[PDB]
Design a protein around this ligand. Structure first.
Ligand SMILES: O=C(O)CCC(=O)Nc1ccc(Br)cn1
Ligand SMILES: O=C(O)CCC(=O)Nc1ccc(Br)cn1
Length: 149
């Protein structure tokens, strides 16, 4: 499986950082604190694809953790899920790990492959969790990607 290392920023230009072991949060970041931003390994996985819709998994660089979409208290929910490090990343990632990376107007949306029309989202307010949202409103669902060495 092929992977690229990257960071993500939402379209309000908030960076993503760890909020405890199994949550991300989004905040405006610049300067020295830049290094606290999460580096992803974006893997290009099996699934239905088009010019503008590319299935990916989002693992945390050199951690056995992946963003995962599951029902929690009966709602689609974003979580950070641990995996066996000897078996990941792999080309046939389980559906809960797969996001359709969609380019629209020079930005990126990450739709859950498991839960159609639910998206990786951030709040307008600073220091709030990254979450799975079913509305494209006040919540932000557009991102840019930055390549890292
Ligand atoms: O993220 C930034 O503001 C700079 C890097 C950048 O241009 N990233 C980018 C551009 C177009 C798309 Br689509 C996704 N990511
Ligand atoms: O996946 C895509 O089509 C967009 C990716 C993209 O344009 N990324 C990017 C990253 C850094 C810089 Br600088 C410019 N563009």
């Amino acid at each position: 499986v092929r992977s690229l290392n990257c960071t993500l920023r939402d379209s309000q230009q908030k960076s993503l950082v760890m909020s405890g072991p199994y949550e991300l949060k989004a905040l405006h970041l610049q300067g020295q604190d830049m290094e606290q931003q999460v580096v992803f390994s974006m893997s290009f996985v099996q699934g239905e694809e088009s010019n503008d819709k590319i299935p990916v998994a989002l693992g945390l660089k050199e951690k056995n953790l992946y963003l995962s979409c599951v029902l929690k208290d009966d709602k689609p929910t974003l979580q950070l899920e641990s995996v066996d490090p000897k078996n990941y990343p792999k080309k046939k990632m389980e559906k809960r790990f797969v996001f359709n990376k969609i380019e629209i107007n020079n930005k990126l949306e990450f739709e859950s492959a498991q839960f159609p029309n639910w998206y990786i989202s951030t709040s307008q307010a600073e220091n709030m969790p990254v979450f799975l949202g079913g509305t494209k409103g006040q919540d932000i669902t557009d991102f840019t990607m930055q390549f890292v060495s």
